[PDB]
Design a protein around this ligand. Structure first.
Ligand code: MET
Ligand code: NA
Ligand code: NA
Length: 502
């Protein structure tokens, strides 16, 4: 089996997996919609009671299976639990990261296209009226991805966006095709430091923004000023948990796959904690101190919150660059922003495609070259669905990137810490660890976490089961139909891999 060269490269590769678009786009939106500081309390708690324990759990499961030559859940779920149904559940460890990858890589190609256009200086040019400043950039984005005037089902991506997507795929391939140590690790040691530098620079530059409408300090205050009136709102807890799952790459089967390349004897405790810690630092300190403070600086808190609620991409691709264009060298500053997003996304995209690649290598015994090329072909082809079908992206991000990750997170925890045995799991986690997991986390993993997630899923299911059936748009049905087809396809591959063994 292939292994990580150094401990540092391992940390940066894992950090690269977690730290991504979720930090600089998803988080700011989530924190702003839930009342800033009010969102921080449930967020930290969710990080302690869910993020950390699951992180360690995924690392352990990854290394455990990796020792036997299996990096994907279909095989690992079977090693921990002997059953056909264990393999079927394991299919999600491929389905989720593949589905997510389909639209994630497209969003990534956006930041690249924007990065390129902002570098060359091809951007809209605003003249004191907020709408007259934002409109040009809204029209810019809509011209790029091909947004319809009314609410029409069809998208019309510009030739450029399409070509940029091809290029993005090519970049993802050139990195993945070189393997774990030569491809991902090498790039991690570069991308990450660069990412951190750009982030710090942007945070500082943004912190210097002060206008008659407010300052960046007002945004930092808003985000870090506690509010206990929102602690009774379940939605805030749900959003915080969802964010923790998405930002830490939990339930994507990505962490497990990456962990399967960790030598059986190497530590996974201190390594995992470091990766997760690096992600939170990059999330709350960096990600939360760029977008939000900037919007609050120019448009004040009320408007900033309004803009955050407006959409997930509205703050990142429209509002922020619009704000920069009003400052000296704002065009180049926008370039740095989109270059930051691109690297963060690139380090993450290669992580959610790896599970698929690792399954082809491990279970179907395909060479690394073929596995990567086929995985790229699949994602690229499937991507057309997100490119040309409106609301398709949201559907995939919901079923896979929201509901699926939590369900899968609960499933993997139940399989590892209950069925496989709590003591055996605990001993497997601490084995070879430079430091040891606090004894208390044994009862967080076994009791607190699964209960919290179970409750969360029940609540979710109750609200979504009626809405699903009554949904007018056909685009969403096509999407559901197709992703379901993907699931069958993967289940069929798992079947073939199972027969080859015999
Ligand atoms: C694409 S890996 C899962 C998502 C990633 N951790 C992010 O926050 O962007
Ligand atoms: Na990343
Ligand atoms: Na993250």
């Amino acid at each position: 089996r292939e292994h990580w060269a150094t401990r540092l490269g391992l940390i940066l590769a894992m950090a690269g997996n977690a730290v991504g678009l979720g930090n600089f786009l998803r988080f700011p939106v989530q924190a702003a919609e839930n009342g800033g500081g009010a969102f921080m309390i449930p967020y930290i708690i969710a990080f302690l009671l869910v993020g950390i324990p699951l992180m360690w759990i995924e690392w352990a499961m990854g290394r455990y299976g990796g020792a036997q030559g299996h990096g994907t859940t279909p095989a690992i779920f079977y090693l921990l639990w002997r059953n056909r149904f264990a393999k079927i559940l394991g299919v999600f460890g491929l389905w989720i990261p593949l589905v997510v990858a389909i639209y994630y890589v497209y969003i990534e190609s956006w930041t690249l296209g924007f990065a390129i256009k902002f570098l060359v200086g091809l951007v809209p040019e605003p003249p004191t009226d907020p709408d007259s400043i934002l409109r040009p950039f809204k029209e810019f984005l809509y011209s790029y991805i091909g947004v319809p005037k009314g609410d029409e089902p069809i998208l019309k991506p510009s030739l450029f966006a399409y070509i940029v997507f091809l290029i993005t795929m090519f970049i993802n391939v050139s990195i993945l095709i070189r393997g774990i140590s030569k491809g991902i690790e090498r790039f991690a040691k570069i991308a990450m430091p660069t990412l951190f530098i750009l982030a710090v620079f942007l945070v500082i530059r943004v912190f210097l923004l002060e206008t008659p409408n407010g300052t960046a300090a007002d945004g930092l205050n808003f985000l870090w000023t506690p509010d206990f009136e929102k602690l009774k709102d379940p939605g805030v807890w749900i959003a915080a948990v969802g964010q923790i799952f998405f930002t830490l790459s939990l339930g994507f089967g990505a962490i497990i796959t990456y962990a399967s390349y960790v030598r059986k004897d190497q530590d996974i405790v201190l390594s995992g904690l470091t990766a997760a810690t690096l992600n939170e630092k990059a999330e709350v300190i960096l990600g939360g101190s760029i977008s939000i403070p900037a919007a609050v600086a120019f448009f004040g808190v009320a408007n900033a919150v309004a803009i955050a609620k407006a959409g997930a991409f509205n703050l990142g691709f429209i509002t922020l660059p619009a704000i920069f264009s009003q400052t000296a060298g704002g065009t180049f500053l926008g370039f740095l922003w989109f270059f930051l997003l691109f690297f963060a996304g690139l380090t993450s995209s290669i992580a959610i495609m790896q599970p698929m690649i690792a399954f082809l290598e491990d279970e179907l015994k395909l060479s690394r070259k073929h596995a990567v090329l086929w995985t790229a072909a699949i994602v690229f082809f499937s991507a057309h669905l997100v490119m040309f079908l409106n609301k398709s992206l949201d559907e995939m991000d919901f079923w896979a990137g929201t509901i699926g990750v939590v369900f899968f997170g609960l499933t993997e925890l139940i399989i590892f810490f209950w069925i496989f045995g709590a003591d055996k799991a605990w001993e497997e986690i601490n084995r070879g660890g430079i430091i040891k997991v606090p004894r208390i986390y044994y009862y967080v993993m076994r009791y607190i976490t699964p209960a919290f997630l179970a409750v969360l899923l029940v609540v979710w299911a109750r609200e979504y089961i009626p809405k699903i059936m009554e949904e007018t748009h056909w685009t969403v049905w096509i999407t559901r139909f197709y992703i379901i087809g993907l699931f069958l396809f993967l289940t069929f591959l798992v079947f073939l891999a199972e027969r080859r063994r015999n």
